[PDB]
Amino acid sequence: VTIAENCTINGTLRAEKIVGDIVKAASAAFPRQRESSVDWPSGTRTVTVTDD
Amino acid sequence: DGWLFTAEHTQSVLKGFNKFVVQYATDSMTSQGKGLSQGSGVAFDNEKFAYNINNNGHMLRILDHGAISMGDNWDMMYVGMYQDINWDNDNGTKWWTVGIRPMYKWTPIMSTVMEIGYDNVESQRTGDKNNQYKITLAQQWQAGDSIWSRPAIRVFATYAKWDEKWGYDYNGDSKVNPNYGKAVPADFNGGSFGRGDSDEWTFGAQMEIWW
C-alpha cells in the first residue's frame, strides 16, 4: 500500500518494522566467567544496526 | 561474653625452665584466644561490609614449652602445642605444633643454631588437614653464651615443605560470596585455596635484639 497523504487508524496499529522518526533500542549483559563462588564479567558483545 | 581459665606450672630444670599450661576458653574468649573478648561476632570484609564470624563454642589449649641447657656447649628450646577450637558454626580448627631449636656454641660469641618445626591443622567444617615441616640452619653471633643472649646477628638458610588440603575463601566480598571466611577444600568448584603442596628454600641475614 502506498498512501500519499495522512493515514488515520482509530484502533491498533501492528507493524513489524517501523522506519521513521522513532527510537530503536537494544541491550545485553557481558558474559560472566566464574570459579568456585565468584564470577566476573569478561566477554564480547556485538550490536548491529542496519542501514534501512 | 566469655570465660578463660588458665593453669600454668613452671619447673626449674637443667639451668632452664619448663612451662606446662592448660587453658580453657568459652565463647567470646575463643576467637582471639589470649584473654581478650570479642563478643559481637561481626567483622568487616574487604569492601567494609559486615559479616558474621560468630564464636560460640569453646577452645582447649594444652601447651608445654621450655628451655634446657645440656653440657657447656648445648642449649635447646622446645615446644609442644595442641589447640582445639570447637565452634557452633563448625568453622573451628585442631592445631598440633611440635618444635625444637638446638644451639651449639663453638666460642662464647659464635654459635650454630638449628630449628625443626612441624605444624598440622585440621579444619572442623571440612575435615581436611594442612601440614608443614620447616628446617632452618643458621650461624649466629650473640652477646653472651646463652640461647637468650640477644644483640644476635644470624646468617640463615631455611627450607619448608608443606601440603595443604584446605584453605579460607576470601575472594570477592561478603555480599556476593556465601563462603566468605569459611574453610573450603583446596579444589572447591575449580577454585584454588591454601598454599597447595610444595616446598621452598630461603636464605639471608637478620638481627634480633631486646634491651
Side-chain angles (χ1 to χ4, degrees):
Chain A
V1 171
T2 295
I3 303 140
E5 309 222 327
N6 322 310
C7 152
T8 312
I9 289 118
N10 288 331
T12 278
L13 164 75
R14 189 262 207 73
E16 276 203 45
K17 250 196 64 41
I18 312 198
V19 183
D21 213 294
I22 37 72
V23 169
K24 296 300 209 209
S27 166
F30 287 108
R32 290 199 98 73
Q33 181 111 44
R34 104 182 316 289
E35 57 165 285
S36 206
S37 321
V38 167
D39 61 46
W40 56 92
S42 92
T44 324
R45 286 290 179 231
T46 329
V47 165
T48 324
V49 205
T50 331
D51 202 356
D52 49 22
Chain B
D1 67 26
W3 284 97
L4 181 90
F5 314 91
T6 130
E8 156 179 288
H9 173 265
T10 146
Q11 172 94 261
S12 197
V13 56
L14 289 148
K15 293 165 240 312
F17 69 91
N18 161 265
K19 300 210 191 185
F20 178 74
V21 351
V22 199
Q23 294 201 314
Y24 181 73
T26 69
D27 278 8
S28 82
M29 305 290 265
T30 51
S31 91
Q32 186 233 330
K34 312 180 189 331
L36 288 184
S37 115
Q38 303 172 350
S40 79
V42 165
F44 282 114
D45 78 22
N46 297 334
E47 303 288 357
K48 256 43 188 308
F49 283 104
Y51 75 103
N52 236 321
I53 62 164
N54 198 43
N55 45 19
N56 282 88
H58 69 266
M59 173 219 75
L60 172 84
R61 177 188 281 139
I62 310 178
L63 158 75
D64 167 83
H65 63 110
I68 288 316
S69 147
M70 320 78 92
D72 295 313
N73 303 328
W74 285 96
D75 273 35
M76 183 139 94
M77 317 210 186
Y78 61 91
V79 152
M81 157 146 291
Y82 167 74
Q83 169 174 294
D84 165 42
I85 300 191
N86 201 312
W87 276 345
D88 276 12
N89 61 0
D90 264 43
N91 211 28
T93 26
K94 272 207 220 166
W95 172 31
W96 292 86
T97 257
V98 191
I100 195 195
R101 180 209 276 216
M103 173 218 173
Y104 179 80
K105 344 176 188 167
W106 319 82
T107 248
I109 283 320
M110 179 204 33
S111 42
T112 167
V113 190
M114 318 81 182
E115 184 186 76
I116 313 131
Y118 181 77
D119 286 330
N120 182 26
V121 189
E122 167 198 16
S123 168
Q124 182 183 29
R125 94 187 275 277
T126 47
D128 276 306
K129 268 159 215 249
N130 298 358
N131 68 98
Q132 148 165 316
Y133 62 100
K134 173 179 91 54
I135 311 123
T136 165
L137 174 51
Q139 184 94 11
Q140 86 162 17
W141 292 263
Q142 77 266 319
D145 69 304
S146 188
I147 202 150
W148 290 110
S149 292
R150 234 16 153 207
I153 302 137
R154 322 137 181 204
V155 278
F156 65 86
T158 304
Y159 171 77
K161 158 97 173 73
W162 66 89
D163 181 29
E164 318 227 315
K165 315 274 231 286
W166 63 270
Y168 286 107
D169 183 293
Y170 283 117
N171 310 343
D173 58 83
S174 32
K175 321 147 71 203
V176 307
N177 196 340
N179 297 269
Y180 191 89
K182 300 291 164 68
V184 289
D187 42 50
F188 194 60
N189 300 348
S192 76
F193 308 99
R195 304 145 71 217
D197 175 19
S198 202
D199 63 338
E200 183 80 80
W201 73 281
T202 81
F203 51 101
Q206 205 211 356
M207 73 94 189
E208 179 145 48
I209 183 179
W210 50 68
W211 72 96

